[PDB]
Design a protein around this motif. Structure first.
Motif, PDB file in Angstrom:
ATOM      1  N   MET A  72     -18.693  -1.094  79.597  1.00 13.67           N
ATOM      2  CA  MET A  72     -17.313  -0.600  79.677  1.00 13.67           C
ATOM      3  C   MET A  72     -17.288   0.884  79.613  1.00 13.67           C
ATOM      4  N   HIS A  73     -16.173   1.490  80.052  1.00 16.81           N
ATOM      5  CA  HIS A  73     -15.968   2.964  80.094  1.00 16.81           C
ATOM      6  C   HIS A  73     -15.581   3.436  78.752  1.00 16.81           C
ATOM      7  N   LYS A  74     -16.201   4.587  78.430  1.00 12.30           N
ATOM      8  CA  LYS A  74     -16.348   5.190  77.133  1.00 12.30           C
ATOM      9  C   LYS A  74     -15.085   5.256  76.277  1.00 12.30           C
ATOM     10  N   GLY A  75     -13.984   5.716  76.900  1.00 10.71           N
ATOM     11  CA  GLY A  75     -12.678   5.696  76.201  1.00 10.71           C
ATOM     12  C   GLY A  75     -12.311   7.021  75.599  1.00 10.71           C
ATOM     13  N   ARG A  76     -12.033   8.065  76.432  1.00 11.71           N
ATOM     14  CA  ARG A  76     -11.497   9.368  75.990  1.00 11.71           C
ATOM     15  C   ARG A  76      -9.986   9.311  75.857  1.00 11.71           C
ATOM     16  N   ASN A  77      -9.357  10.186  75.004  1.00 10.61           N
ATOM     17  CA  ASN A  77      -7.933  10.360  74.815  1.00 10.61           C
ATOM     18  C   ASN A  77      -7.571  11.835  74.602  1.00 10.61           C
ATOM     19  N   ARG A  78      -6.346  12.109  75.092  1.00  9.66           N
ATOM     20  CA  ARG A  78      -5.815  13.426  74.957  1.00  9.66           C
ATOM     21  C   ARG A  78      -4.922  13.653  73.698  1.00  9.66           C
ATOM     22  N   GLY A  79      -4.861  12.675  72.807  1.00 15.92           N
ATOM     23  CA  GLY A  79      -3.926  12.529  71.701  1.00 15.92           C
ATOM     24  C   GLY A  79      -4.187  11.093  71.066  1.00 15.92           C
ATOM     25  N   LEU A  80      -3.213  10.185  71.086  1.00 16.56           N
ATOM     26  CA  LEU A  80      -3.264   8.958  70.376  1.00 16.56           C
ATOM     27  C   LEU A  80      -3.601   7.875  71.273  1.00 16.56           C
ATOM     28  N   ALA A  81      -4.613   7.108  70.918  1.00 12.83           N
ATOM     29  CA  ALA A  81      -5.004   5.848  71.473  1.00 12.83           C
ATOM     30  C   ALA A  81      -4.785   4.718  70.486  1.00 12.83           C
ATOM     31  N   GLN A  82      -3.617   4.610  69.854  1.00 14.02           N
ATOM     32  CA  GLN A  82      -3.253   3.670  68.781  1.00 14.02           C
ATOM     33  C   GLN A  82      -3.931   3.872  67.396  1.00 14.02           C
ATOM     34  N   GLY A 110      -8.533  12.666  61.066  1.00 13.34           N
ATOM     35  CA  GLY A 110      -9.350  13.206  62.160  1.00 13.34           C
ATOM     36  C   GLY A 110      -9.958  12.211  63.115  1.00 13.34           C
ATOM     37  N   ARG A 111     -10.774  12.701  64.063  1.00 17.01           N
ATOM     38  CA  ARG A 111     -11.005  11.810  65.204  1.00 17.01           C
ATOM     39  C   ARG A 111     -12.494  11.857  65.484  1.00 17.01           C
ATOM     40  N   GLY A 112     -12.987  10.696  66.021  1.00 16.24           N
ATOM     41  CA  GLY A 112     -14.382  10.640  66.356  1.00 16.24           C
ATOM     42  C   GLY A 112     -14.849   9.201  66.402  1.00 16.24           C
ATOM     43  N   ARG A 113     -16.226   9.104  66.467  1.00 14.95           N
ATOM     44  CA  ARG A 113     -16.913   7.813  66.783  1.00 14.95           C
ATOM     45  C   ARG A 113     -17.596   7.229  65.562  1.00 14.95           C
ATOM     46  N   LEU A 114     -17.651   5.915  65.590  1.00 16.01           N
ATOM     47  CA  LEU A 114     -18.388   5.109  64.635  1.00 16.01           C
ATOM     48  C   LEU A 114     -19.223   4.093  65.448  1.00 16.01           C
ATOM     49  N   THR A 115     -20.516   3.985  65.159  1.00 16.54           N
ATOM     50  CA  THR A 115     -21.612   3.159  65.816  1.00 16.54           C
ATOM     51  C   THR A 115     -21.650   1.826  65.119  1.00 16.54           C
ATOM     52  N   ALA A 116     -20.591   1.369  64.306  1.00 15.64           N
ATOM     53  CA  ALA A 116     -20.517   0.142  63.517  1.00 15.64           C
ATOM     54  C   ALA A 116     -21.427   0.190  62.259  1.00 15.64           C
ATOM     55  N   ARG A 117     -22.526   0.898  62.303  1.00 12.41           N
ATOM     56  CA  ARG A 117     -23.518   1.129  61.200  1.00 12.41           C
ATOM     57  C   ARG A 117     -22.850   1.838  60.001  1.00 12.41           C
ATOM     58  N   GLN A 118     -21.943   2.744  60.281  1.00  8.80           N
ATOM     59  CA  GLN A 118     -21.122   3.546  59.376  1.00  8.80           C
ATOM     60  C   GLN A 118     -20.021   2.697  58.713  1.00  8.80           C
ATOM     61  N   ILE A 119     -19.313   1.858  59.432  1.00  7.78           N
ATOM     62  CA  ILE A 119     -18.401   0.854  58.944  1.00  7.78           C
ATOM     63  C   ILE A 119     -19.055  -0.032  57.955  1.00  7.78           C
ATOM     64  N   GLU A 120     -20.221  -0.560  58.316  1.00  6.71           N
ATOM     65  CA  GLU A 120     -21.067  -1.399  57.376  1.00  6.71           C
ATOM     66  C   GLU A 120     -21.410  -0.630  56.165  1.00  6.71           C
ATOM     67  N   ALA A 121     -22.071   0.526  56.310  1.00  5.85           N
ATOM     68  CA  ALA A 121     -22.416   1.423  55.217  1.00  5.85           C
ATOM     69  C   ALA A 121     -21.278   1.716  54.226  1.00  5.85           C
ATOM     70  N   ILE A 145     -11.870   6.112  66.221  1.00  5.76           N
ATOM     71  CA  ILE A 145     -10.907   6.478  65.190  1.00  5.76           C
ATOM     72  C   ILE A 145     -10.175   7.658  65.813  1.00  5.76           C
ATOM     73  N   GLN A 146      -8.863   7.633  65.625  1.00  6.48           N
ATOM     74  CA  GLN A 146      -7.864   8.488  66.189  1.00  6.48           C
ATOM     75  C   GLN A 146      -7.222   9.246  64.976  1.00  6.48           C
ATOM     76  N   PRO A 147      -6.317  10.267  65.221  1.00 12.15           N
ATOM     77  CA  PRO A 147      -5.930  11.083  64.081  1.00 12.15           C
ATOM     78  C   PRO A 147      -4.834  10.424  63.272  1.00 12.15           C
ATOM     79  N   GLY A 148      -5.074  10.318  61.973  1.00 12.69           N
ATOM     80  CA  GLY A 148      -4.394   9.583  60.939  1.00 12.69           C
ATOM     81  C   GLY A 148      -4.584   8.056  61.013  1.00 12.69           C
ATOM     82  N   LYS A 149      -5.611   7.520  61.658  1.00 16.99           N
ATOM     83  CA  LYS A 149      -5.858   6.091  61.743  1.00 16.99           C
ATOM     84  C   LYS A 149      -6.351   5.689  60.405  1.00 16.99           C
TER      85      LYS A 149
END
Lengths: 94, 71, 136, 141, 164, 38, 176
Positions: free
Chosen positions: C12-22, C37-48, C96-100
């Motif tokens: 699937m396509h990566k999934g960029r946003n210019r603001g809020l993606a829910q 704040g905003r950024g990526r989680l590889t699921a390993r971090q969620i587990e951790a 993760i999106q800003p204030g998620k």
RNA sequence: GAUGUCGGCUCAUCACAUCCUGGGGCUGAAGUAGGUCCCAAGGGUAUGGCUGUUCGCCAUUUAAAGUGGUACGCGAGCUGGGUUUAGAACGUCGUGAGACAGUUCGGUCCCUAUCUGCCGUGGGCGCUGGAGAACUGAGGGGGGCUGCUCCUAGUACGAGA
RNA sequence: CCGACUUACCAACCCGAUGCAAACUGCGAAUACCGGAGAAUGUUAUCACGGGAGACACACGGCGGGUGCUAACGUCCGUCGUGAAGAGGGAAACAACCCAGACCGCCAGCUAAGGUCCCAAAGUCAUGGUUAAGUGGGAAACGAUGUGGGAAGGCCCAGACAGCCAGGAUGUUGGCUUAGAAGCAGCCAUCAUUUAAAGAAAGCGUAAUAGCUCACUGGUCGAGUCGGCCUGCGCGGAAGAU
């Protein structure tokens, strides 16, 4: 159960609402039925920490604006996407 | 800003210290405060050659008695 | 990793946003951990992060999870010249999106849930906020 | 650092205070000799019972002097005595290796009253109740 | 209060008893060194006398906001207060039991039913009274000191070991 | 001591003190918990 | 500071001289016994010292507590005399005074050449005990700081020079 | 319309996260010792062999045998050893021409320096009339490393060594 | 022999609540677009056919997505400013950025982006808050009582807050275990006591015992303080080749 303040206001658009948040104020609205609500400005903090407990939402509020007192309780809340402070709140009359 | 220069070393580089300047007449602290305030190469030099400072409060290189000045 | 079996499609396509993606508010309980704040989680971090919260709270209170990895993400390794197709599917990413808000609780006292989220925020790549709900 | 802290514990017989290993290592370290302790402790311990351990609680100054308060026989020895045991259970309130009468417990309470602070002769008793419970002795009428 | 109740609680606690109390004694020994502290607790439950340790700030606020027993400046610096509400003679007896391990020069002064009793007088009060022998000595003190002889009318139980 | 950053405490109290512009953590009765960085 | 907003009482004959951000204390002084505070003005009166406003460093009340500690210290200083008890733990090190010099060692024949000003003096009862004598609180601790700057108290048996607040735990040999 | 390589020799140079002495915290460091450990550009920082050799394997010196960069330093330095360098041909493969970083035999590497630097060196001019003589230090680098044992010292400490 | 009383547990379709999606949809903007009709303006932007092409090789960057790790002065596509195809102002400079569009002349004025102690053209500006670090004027994780303001709030002159001092207690060295086994080697008691105050103890520590920090009490002591959260300034984290 708390004693809070309001000044009367109505706005339209992002720019206006941001012009409130520029001087640490934000808006709110008072509903009941399906009619034209009582639109007000609030202070950011006079409704966040009084709100850090469930008594804000379970019990009724003395909200003072231009000698009007109407009685209201909180409803669902709009929050900033970088701060826990209140972007916009709803109320129902009680 | 401790004004490093090439002058030949091993292992490192040899330098002048800020600390040397005070021990070998009081001028040099005052001197690289007004030097650095003048332009480019040649003009900054034509300007510079009009300053004198010496040992200070004791220096003979004042016998003229100039125009007195407080700034 | 604490990842899903199959969402959407497998690659699937990566999934960029210019603001809020829910995702931007609280949705359960009396308290939670907000991102701001905003950024990526590889699921390993969620587990951790989940481990940290389970090591502080024990049996006192159940956990409600308010995030999951949505999108599969390919890698094309750092051993071969880029420009020609799409790599193997490597990890599932939570956006993760800003204030998620990420995780919410109510079972355990406020100070156990707040502290449990400070430990969880060291496993995360940003600076975060304890967020309070009380009912809604 | 200065050794100016907290009531230091020891509980020792009069002749159990000449060697070091029964006592623990600590007095040696705080500037007190085993010999001087032994002479100072017998002064107030052999006035009474000496074949069983008398509790003693110590304060130490930053100048390597000592003070010690010496007491009558512990309620804890008496509860062993009065109960016919020398050893408890090692898992109290879940295993019980003997029993003590209440009317007897009050005579134990009274023997420890030379240093007990309780406002009624029962209050003294209620403190040694949990002493009996620790040693596997059931408190019954 | 909700951080620390312990400090707010202690102001009401002196003020209640010290309004209440037939004798109290305001003395200096500080809220350290357990050995003397334990012994004044210990003997105090024997004689029927209660003892609190209290700052001079707390003590001055207890006299400002509420009635006290007339020792309104007899507190200075770190100060302990021993007091009896029912048996005045016990109050003076407790320092004579307590000097057997520390001292008696610890009293600054005492009060007895509103009158100032100084620190020389209490050594007479303390000689194994029950309540009636304390009371009797306070009447023997006044009778002496008041120059009229109308002030004396009974000694046959009023100045005996009998009820006074 | 070591180059341990962050000046979180190591005992129930430390003297938390900013020395030469680096905040050191250290206990009030112990040299062990002296750390060069924070 | 709570305590710069309450005055500090000064005995008879104690002269506390106000002439600037330096304040200088005499009574029955061995030496120059003096106090540095900037952010406050201290007037002497003659029985009690009065604390009020002047200019100083950007931290809040930076000198007003400083003036309170230091004034009272120097005033106790000239009257009774300040504290004097210095000591060392261990044996085989010396603590022998000779004049204004204190002979101490790590293991070596030569002295460590630890020396004192005119303003202060010493003697030693025993080869671990040092008595320093004077009236200014600062200087007695400055020679104590220098004495601990060749051997310190460090936890293995505890051996070293001990003075004021102490930072050592007095550990032993290991056994597991 | 040239930022051109391995390997050996020479000649260097700078970053300190220092191989080491040196001042110093800690230690589950008694002391000795080590682990842990920070400041530090100041200074000494090894070599012969086989092999074209990195890396290897081996003997060894000195108390000692460090890390990193430099058009993977330096062919407007040196040789031209290395890859079928260009050549058979062994080993290998294809019908063959031709190829191979497995291989063995010897085998073409340029610049006298314009400006620039670096070190040595002279002419000419300001030095306040000229001349000769000593000369101050505005300025700037060099020694700078490191073992041994006598004393220091068999002493504190440790169970004892 | 056939048959069967008998859920204790897991984790689903489902169910409620909760999270989510280019290639999924119950719902759905802003803006863009056309032709008419109108304002305004453009020395044709657009239309027929005849002559000449060049460009198809673009690049640091705005808007957005795919490819890539939400790595890269990365790569490509619809869209665009500047260079290409344009002088000047500012940036230690530049191909490409920001302001801006070079007719030519003017010891003219004004304003932009950018600036105002000297370099260097203009503010060491008037008034207030804060950092001790050349941070400013070099970046994130990250942490803490580094420092101040603000509303709501707990504490809050009735004594705070934090630390330094001193106490850390009565039974008690409770029981076992054991070099001893003490709140802190392990485990069970896990309480009671005079109290104003002291947990049969939160953390460290020759592992213990010791030594030590800790609220609470009383000195210093009589006014701010701290937790959440908004915010300026700080810290170490932040070591490499003239």
């Amino acid at each position: 159960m708390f004693t809070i303040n309001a000044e009367v206001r109505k706005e339209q658009g992002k720019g206006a609402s941001r012009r409130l948040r520029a001087a640490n104020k934000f808006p709110a609205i008072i509903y009941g039925g399906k009619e034209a609500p009582l639109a007000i400005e609030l202070d950011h903090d006079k409704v966040m920490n009084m709100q850090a407990k469930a008594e804000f939402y379970s019990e009724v509020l003395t909200i003072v604006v231009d000698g009007k007192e109407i009685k209201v309780k909180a409803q669902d809340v709009q929050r900033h996407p970088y701060k826990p402070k209140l972007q916009h709140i709803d109320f129902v009359r009680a | 800003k401790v004004y490093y220069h090439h002058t030949g070393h091993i292992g490192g580089i040899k330098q002048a210290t800020f600390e040397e300047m005070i021990a070998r007449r009081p001028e040099r602290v005052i001197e690289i405060a007004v030097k650095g305030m003048l332009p480019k190469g040649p003009l900054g030099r034509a300007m510079f050659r009009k300053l004198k400072v010496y040992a200070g409060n004791e220096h003979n290189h004042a016998a003229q008695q100039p125009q007195v000045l407080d700034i | 990793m604490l990842q899903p079996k199959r969402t959407k499609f497998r690659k699937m396509h990566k999934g960029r946003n210019r603001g809020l993606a829910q995702g931007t508010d609280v949705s359960f309980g009396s308290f939670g951990l907000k991102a701001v704040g905003r950024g990526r989680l590889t699921a390993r971090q969620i587990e951790a992060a989940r481990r940290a919260m389970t090591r502080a709270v024990k049996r006192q209170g159940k956990i409600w999870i308010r995030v999951f990895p949505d999108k599969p993400i390919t890698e094309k390794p750092l051993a071969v010249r880029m420009g020609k197709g799409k790599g193997n599917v490597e990890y599932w990413v939570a956006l993760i999106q800003p204030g998620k808000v990420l995780y919410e609780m109510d079972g355990v006292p406020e100070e156990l849930a707040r502290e449990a989220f400070k430990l969880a925020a060291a496993k995360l790549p940003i600076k975060t906020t304890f967020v309070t709900k009380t009912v809604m | 650092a200065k050794k100016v802290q907290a009531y230091v514990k020891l509980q020792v017989a009069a002749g159990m205070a000449n060697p070091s290993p029964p006592v623990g290592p600590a007095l040696g370290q705080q500037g007190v000799n085993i010999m001087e302790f032994c002479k100072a402790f017998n002064a107030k311990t052999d006035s009474i019972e000496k074949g069983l351990p008398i509790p003693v609680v110590i304060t130490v100054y930053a100048d390597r002097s000592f003070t010690f308060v010496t007491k009558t026989p512990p309620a804890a020895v008496l509860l062993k005595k009065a109960a016919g045991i020398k050893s408890g259970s090692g898992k109290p309130n879940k295993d019980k290796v003997g029993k003590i009468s209440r009317a007897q417990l009050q005579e134990i309470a009274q023997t420890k009253a030379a240093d007990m602070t309780g406002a009624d002769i029962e209050a003294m008793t209620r403190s040694i109740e949990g002493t009996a419970r620790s040693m596997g002795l059931v408190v019954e009428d | 209060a909700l951080n620390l109740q312990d400090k707010q609680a202690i102001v009401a606690e002196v003020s209640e008893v010290a309004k209440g109390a037939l004798s109290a004694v305001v003395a200096d020994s500080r809220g350290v060194t357990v050995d003397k502290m334990t012994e004044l607790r210990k003997a105090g439950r024997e004689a029927g006398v209660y003892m609190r340790v209290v700052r001079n700030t707390l003590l001055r606020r207890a006299v400002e906001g509420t009635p006290f027993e007339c020792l309104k400046d007899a507190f200075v610096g770190p100060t302990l207060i021993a007091y009896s509400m029912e048996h005045p003679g016990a109050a003076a007896r407790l320092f004579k039991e307590f000097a057997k391990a520390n001292a008696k020069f610890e009293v600054k002064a005492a009060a007895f039913e509103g009158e100032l009793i100084p620190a020389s007088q209490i050594d007479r009060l303390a000689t194994l009274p029950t309540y009636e022998e304390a009371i009797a000595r306070l009447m023997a003190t006044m009778k002496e000191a008041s120059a009229g002889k109308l002030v004396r009318t009974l000694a046959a139980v009023r100045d005996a070991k009998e009820a006074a | 001591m070591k180059v341990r950053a962050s000046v979180k405490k190591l005992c129930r109290n430390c003297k938390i003190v900013k020395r030469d512009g680096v905040i050191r953590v250290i206990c009030s009765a112990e040299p062990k918990h002296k750390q060069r960085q924070g | 500071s709570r305590v710069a907003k309450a005055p500090v009482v000064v005995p008879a004959g104690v002269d506390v001289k106000i002439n600037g951000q330096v304040i200088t204390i005499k009574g029955k002084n061995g030496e120059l016994t003096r106090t540095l505070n900037d952010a406050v003005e201290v007037k002497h009166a003659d029985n009690t010292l009065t604390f009020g406003p002047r200019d100083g460093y950007a931290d809040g009340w930076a000198q007003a507590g400083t003036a309170r500690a230091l004034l009272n210290s120097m005033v106790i200083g000239v009257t009774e005399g300040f504290t004097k008890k210095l000591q060392l733990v261990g044996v085989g090190y010396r603590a022998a005074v000779k004049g204004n010099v204190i002979n101490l060692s790590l293991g070596f024949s030569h002295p460590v050449d630890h020396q004192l000003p005119a303003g202060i003096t010493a003697e030693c009862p025993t080869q671990t005990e040092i008595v320093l004598k004077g009236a200014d609180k600062q200087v007695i601790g400055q020679v104590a700081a220098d004495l601990r700057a060749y051997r310190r108290p460090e936890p293995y048996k505890g051996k070293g020079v001990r003075y004021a607040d102490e930072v050592v735990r007095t550990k032993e040999a290991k056994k597991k």
